[PDB]
Amino acid sequence: SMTDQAFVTLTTNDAYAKGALVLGSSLKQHRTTRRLVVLATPQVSDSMRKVLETVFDEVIMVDVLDSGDSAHLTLMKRPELGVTLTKLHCWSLTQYSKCVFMDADTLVLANIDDLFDREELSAAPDPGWPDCFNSGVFVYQPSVETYNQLLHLASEQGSFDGGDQGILNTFFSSWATTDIRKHLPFIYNLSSISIYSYLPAFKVFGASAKVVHFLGRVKPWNYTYDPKTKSVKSEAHDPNMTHPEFLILWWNIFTTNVLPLLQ
Amino acid sequence: SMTDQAFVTLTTNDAYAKGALVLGSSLKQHRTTRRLVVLATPQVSDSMRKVLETVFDEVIMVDVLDSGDSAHLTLMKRPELGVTLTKLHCWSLTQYSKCVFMDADTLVLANIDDLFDREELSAAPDPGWPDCFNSGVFVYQPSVETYNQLLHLASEQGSFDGGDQGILNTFFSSWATTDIRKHLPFIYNLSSISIYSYLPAFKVFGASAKVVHFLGRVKPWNYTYDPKTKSVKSEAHDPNMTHPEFLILWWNIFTTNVLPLLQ
Ligand SMILES: *[C@H]1O[C@H](CO)[C@@H](O[C@H]2O[C@H](CO)[C@@H](O[C@H]3O[C@H](CO)[C@@H](O[C@H]4O[C@H](CO)[C@@H](O)[C@H](O)[C@H]4O)[C@H](O)[C@H]3O)[C@H](O)[C@H]2O)[C@H](O)[C@H]1O
Ligand SMILES: *[C@H]1O[C@H](CO)[C@@H](O[C@H]2O[C@H](CO)[C@@H](O[C@H]3O[C@H](CO)[C@@H](O[C@H]4O[C@H](CO)[C@@H](O)[C@H](O)[C@H]4O)[C@H](O)[C@H]3O)[C@H](O)[C@H]2O)[C@H](O)[C@H]1O
Ligand SMILES: O=c1ccn([C@@H]2O[C@H](COP(=O)(O)OP(=O)(O)O)[C@@H](O)[C@H]2O)c(=O)[nH]1
Ligand SMILES: O=c1ccn([C@@H]2O[C@H](COP(=O)(O)OP(=O)(O)O)[C@@H](O)[C@H]2O)c(=O)[nH]1
Ligand SMILES: [Mn+2]
Ligand SMILES: [Mn+2]
C-alpha cells in the first residue's frame, strides 16, 4: 500500500488515451495499491478527460513539450514522437515520493507493485541498443530539481533521438555500467521486437512476462478487432502477430472495460 | 598475457574459415599481445588448416558437437546452427588461464586486450532478448570441470535455442542480475540488429565500436564484392546495408590481407 506512490502515464491525444485507459484498467485488474496518474495535454478532448477520471486517480493537465527534432525523428520514421518530451513533466509530481512511469502503449499482465522497491533511475534494457534503457517503463523520484535540470538539458542540447528516450539516457548515463539493481528485468518491459526476434528465448522466458510494450508505429488501437470471434485482421507482413495473445488481451480489456465508456 | 591468455574462435568448414581468417587478421592489425587460437573440425580442408596456421598461433582439431535440435533451430530459421555446440570445447583449453571466445563472423576494430581484465562469464547483452548475453564474444576461464559440466548439461537437457547460446545462458544464468562488471559494453559486440534498428543510438554511440558482429544468415563471405570500386551487390531488401562500412572493411581485410595467404 502507498498513498504517496503512483503509476504515471501520458497522453497527448484521444488515440493514445485509449492506451492509457487500457493500461490503467490492467493495473486495477492486477490489484495495484498505488495511485494512478495520467498527464494529459490540451488536445485531449473534454469528454475523454472525464473518462480518464474514471480510471485514473489524477488527470493532470500539462503543456506539450515538443523537441521539433525532425532530423532525428524522421531518422526513426517516427516523425510524431517529438511530443514525447512532455513525459518530462512526470518529475514535477512532488506530491509522490516515488513513481513508475509507463508508456500509454503498455499493458500490465501481473501485479508489479514490487517496482517500488527500486530507486531512480531503474529501467529495462532496450532491444534496439541494449546499453540504453527503454523509457517506456521506469522508476523515478519526483523532484523540482531533476525536473528543471531535464527541461534545461532538453532546451540546450535536445535529444539524440528527438524524443524522451535519448535525453533520459544522456541524463541518466550511468545506467549501463552502474548498479545492476537499476536494471529492471526485461519481463517488466517486454517489447514485441523481442516477442518476434529470438523466438526460442520468448518460448522459455515469455510466460513470465509482467508487462508487454506495443512499441512501434502500429498501435493496438489501430487494428480491426472482431469481438465475436476475438480476432484481429493482420497486414500480410505484421510482426506483432508472432504471439498475438497480447494484442488480443489488449482488445478484450478495451472491449469489455473501456469502449463502453466511449461509445 | 603473452603465453597464458588467448583469443579463441571456431570453424567447422572452409566458409566460416574465411571469417576466422579475417577476425585473426584484425586482431593482429590492432596489435594484440595474446595468443590466437582456432578450433577446427574435420570438414575444414587440409589446405585451409594450413592457411589457418599462418594467421593463428594454433589450430586445434576437435570433434563436432551437434545438438540435433531441429525443432529449436528451424524455429529461428537457422537449421545449420546445431554444430555451434562445438564451441563448448573452448573450456578444454587449460593451457590458458583466461580466454576470449569470438565468433568467426566477428571483426575487431580496436585493440580489445582490456577484456582480459574481466572474469568468467563476461559477455554483452543480446539485442534479441537482452536479459541473455550474446555468446559471440565472451570472457571465460578454461576448466576441465566447467567443460564437463557443460557437456553433461548439453547431453541431458540440450539448449533452449538448439545452439550454444541457450545452454551457455542457462549455465551462466546469473548474468542478467549479478555483477554489472560481467556486462561487457555493447561496443565489444555490436551486432547486426543494432546497426539498423535504433539508428539514432548508432549515430551517437557507434563510432566507439570495438567489435562488429555480422550476426544472421547472410555472412560477409556470401556477398559479391568488387575490389575495383569497393562495393558489394545487395539484395534489394538487406537491412545490413544501412551502414555498409563494416562489410566493406571485412572485404578490404579479406582482399588485402587474407587473399595473398590463400595462394
Ligand atoms: C518490428 O516492429 C517494430 C515496429 O514496427 C520495428 O522496430 C523499428 O521501429 C521502432 C520505432 O518505431 C524502433 O524502436 C526504436 O525507436 C523507438 C522510438 O522511435 C524507441 O522507443 C522509445 O523511445 C521513444 C522516443 O524517445 C520513447 O518515447 C518511447 O517511450 C520508447 O519506447 C525504441 O526504444 C527504439 O528501439 C526499432 O529500433 C526499429 O527497429 C521493426 O522494424 C519491425 O520489423
Ligand atoms: C535483420 O537481420 C537480422 C540478422 O541478424 C535478422 O535477425 C533475426 O535472425 C537472427 C538469427 O539469424 C536472430 O538472432 C537470434 O538468433 C541467433 C541464432 O540464430 C542468435 O545468435 C546467437 O546464438 C547462436 C546459437 O546459439 C550462437 O552460436 C551465436 O554465437 C550467437 O550470436 C542471436 O543472438 C539471436 O538474437 C534475430 O534475433 C532475428 O530477428 C532480422 O530478422 C532482420 O530483420
Ligand atoms: O502522439 C503521441 C505520441 C506519444 N505519446 C506518449 O509517448 C509515449 C511514447 O511514444 P510511443 O509509445 O509511440 O513510442 P514507442 O514506444 O513506439 O517507441 C506513448 O506511449 C504515449 O504515452 C503521446 O501521448 N502522444
Ligand atoms: O556451420 C557453422 C555455423 C557456425 N559456426 C561457428 O559458430 C559461430 C556461431 O554461428 P553464427 O555466427 O552463424 O551465428 P549467429 O551469430 O549468426 O547467430 C560462428 O561464428 C562460427 O564460429 C561454424 O563454425 N560453422
Ligand atoms: Mn511505447
Ligand atoms: Mn555470430
Side-chain angles (χ1 to χ4, degrees), chain A residues 3-194 196-232 236 238-263, chain B residues 1-236 238-263:
Chain A
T3 294
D4 61 334
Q5 298 175 334
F7 290 92
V8 179
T9 193
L10 168 67
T11 187
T12 69
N13 63 45
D14 283 8
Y16 278 87
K18 294 185 192 169
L21 291 163
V22 168
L23 167 63
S25 194
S26 77
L27 280 157
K28 286 181 172 290
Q29 176 190 352
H30 295 288
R31 311 168 317 283
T32 185
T33 63
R34 271 67 178 180
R35 308 292 279 176
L36 299 179
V37 178
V38 60
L39 306 168
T41 62
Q43 185 176 1
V44 180
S45 71
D46 293 338
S47 63
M48 181 58 85
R49 293 170 208 189
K50 187 63 164 181
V51 175
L52 289 162
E53 289 174 21
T54 73
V55 174
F56 294 87
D57 299 301
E58 296 202 274
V59 175
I60 300 178
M61 297 308 301
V62 297
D63 298 327
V64 173
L65 306 175
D66 189 340
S67 70
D69 192 348
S70 65
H72 287 141
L73 298 164
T74 288
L75 191 56
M76 301 190 290
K77 309 200 188 299
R78 296 297 300 282
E80 80 281 11
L81 290 187
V83 301
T84 62
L85 265 59
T86 310
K87 284 195 202 172
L88 300 180
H89 294 302
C90 70
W91 271 273
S92 75
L93 306 177
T94 56
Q95 65 268 42
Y96 306 110
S97 55
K98 189 182 280 184
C99 303
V100 177
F101 182 84
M102 303 190 70
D103 263 15
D105 65 331
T106 64
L107 174 63
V108 174
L109 310 168
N111 182 285
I112 56 175
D113 287 352
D114 64 2
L115 287 175
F116 292 96
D117 288 338
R118 310 272 178 158
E119 292 296 304
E120 175 171 284
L121 187 296
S122 299
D126 187 66
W129 193 274
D131 278 359
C132 288
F133 59 86
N134 183 270
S135 57
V137 178
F138 60 86
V139 185
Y140 75 99
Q141 174 178 314
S143 165
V144 184
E145 171 171 23
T146 310
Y147 182 43
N148 281 275
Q149 291 174 306
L150 290 163
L151 293 172
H152 178 61
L153 179 62
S155 178
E156 71 172 355
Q157 180 185 126
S159 172
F160 74 68
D161 72 352
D164 64 288
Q165 190 164 277
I167 185 175
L168 291 177
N169 274 275
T170 299
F171 187 84
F172 294 110
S173 55
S174 68
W175 178 87
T177 57
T178 310
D179 200 350
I180 194 66
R181 301 165 300 168
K182 294 189 180 174
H183 283 228
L184 300 182
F186 187 58
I187 57 172
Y188 288 95
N189 189 357
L190 174 50
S191 32
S192 300
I193 224 186
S194 298
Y196 69 74
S197 299
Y198 186 30
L199 298 175
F202 179 78
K203 186 176 159 68
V204 71
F205 301 125
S208 297
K210 297 173 177 286
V211 178
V212 60
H213 183 184
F214 296 98
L215 186 158
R217 183 179 55 79
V218 177
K219 300 298 197 204
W221 49 90
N222 296 137
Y223 288 77
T224 313
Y225 176 73
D226 187 348
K228 296 195 187 171
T229 58
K230 305 203 189 190
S231 62
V232 297
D238 181 6
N240 249 350
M241 297 304 293
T242 308
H243 291 293
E245 49 197 296
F246 304 119
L247 185 53
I248 76 97
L249 176 56
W250 192 98
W251 271 101
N252 195 47
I253 293 169
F254 180 74
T255 297
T256 306
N257 303 356
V258 185
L259 186 55
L261 290 46
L262 300 182
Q263 62 160 19
Chain B
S1 165
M2 295 179 191
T3 198
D4 65 332
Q5 294 177 338
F7 290 90
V8 179
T9 194
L10 169 67
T11 186
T12 67
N13 61 44
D14 291 0
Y16 275 88
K18 286 183 283 193
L21 290 163
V22 165
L23 171 62
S25 296
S26 78
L27 280 163
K28 290 178 87 71
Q29 176 192 350
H30 295 287
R31 301 190 319 286
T32 185
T33 65
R34 273 73 178 174
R35 299 294 222 232
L36 302 178
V37 171
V38 59
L39 306 172
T41 63
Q43 345 184 3
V44 179
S45 69
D46 295 335
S47 65
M48 184 60 84
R49 295 174 207 187
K50 290 171 184 75
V51 177
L52 289 162
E53 288 179 315
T54 71
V55 171
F56 290 86
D57 295 300
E58 190 155 17
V59 176
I60 302 180
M61 299 308 300
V62 302
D63 300 324
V64 171
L65 303 179
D66 192 334
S67 70
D69 194 349
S70 187
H72 286 139
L73 298 165
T74 51
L75 184 62
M76 307 189 284
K77 301 254 282 173
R78 296 298 299 281
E80 83 286 5
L81 288 184
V83 302
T84 62
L85 287 185
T86 310
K87 282 194 203 173
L88 299 178
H89 297 306
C90 69
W91 268 275
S92 75
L93 304 177
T94 56
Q95 58 265 48
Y96 306 119
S97 56
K98 187 183 287 181
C99 298
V100 176
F101 181 81
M102 303 189 71
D103 260 18
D105 64 332
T106 63
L107 172 64
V108 172
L109 309 170
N111 182 286
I112 54 170
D113 286 354
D114 64 358
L115 289 174
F116 291 96
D117 291 328
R118 309 270 179 167
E119 304 180 322
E120 175 172 285
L121 188 292
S122 297
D126 188 66
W129 194 273
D131 275 3
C132 289
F133 59 88
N134 184 273
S135 61
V137 176
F138 60 87
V139 188
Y140 76 97
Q141 173 177 325
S143 168
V144 180
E145 182 182 353
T146 310
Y147 180 47
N148 281 278
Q149 293 172 312
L150 288 166
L151 293 173
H152 175 66
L153 177 61
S155 278
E156 72 148 19
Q157 297 195 59
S159 174
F160 73 71
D161 70 355
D164 63 287
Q165 189 165 279
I167 182 173
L168 289 176
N169 273 278
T170 298
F171 189 83
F172 297 108
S173 57
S174 68
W175 178 85
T177 57
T178 309
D179 195 350
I180 195 65
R181 302 165 298 174
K182 297 188 180 176
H183 288 223
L184 300 178
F186 183 64
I187 57 170
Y188 285 95
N189 190 357
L190 174 39
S191 44
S192 303
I193 285 174
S194 297
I195 296 152
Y196 68 72
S197 291
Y198 186 31
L199 297 169
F202 181 74
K203 216 198 201 83
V204 299
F205 304 125
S208 300
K210 300 174 174 291
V211 176
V212 58
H213 185 181
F214 300 97
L215 187 152
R217 167 180 54 76
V218 178
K219 297 307 198 201
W221 48 90
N222 294 131
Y223 289 79
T224 302
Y225 177 69
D226 185 344
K228 184 188 175 90
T229 59
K230 300 191 154 193
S231 61
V232 289
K233 275 181 276 201
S234 59
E235 294 293 311
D238 186 8
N240 300 306
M241 290 297 296
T242 57
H243 294 293
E245 62 266 28
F246 301 123
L247 182 53
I248 71 95
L249 176 57
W250 190 98
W251 272 105
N252 196 58
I253 297 170
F254 183 84
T255 300
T256 295
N257 305 328
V258 182
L259 192 52
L261 301 169
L262 296 162
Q263 191 63 20

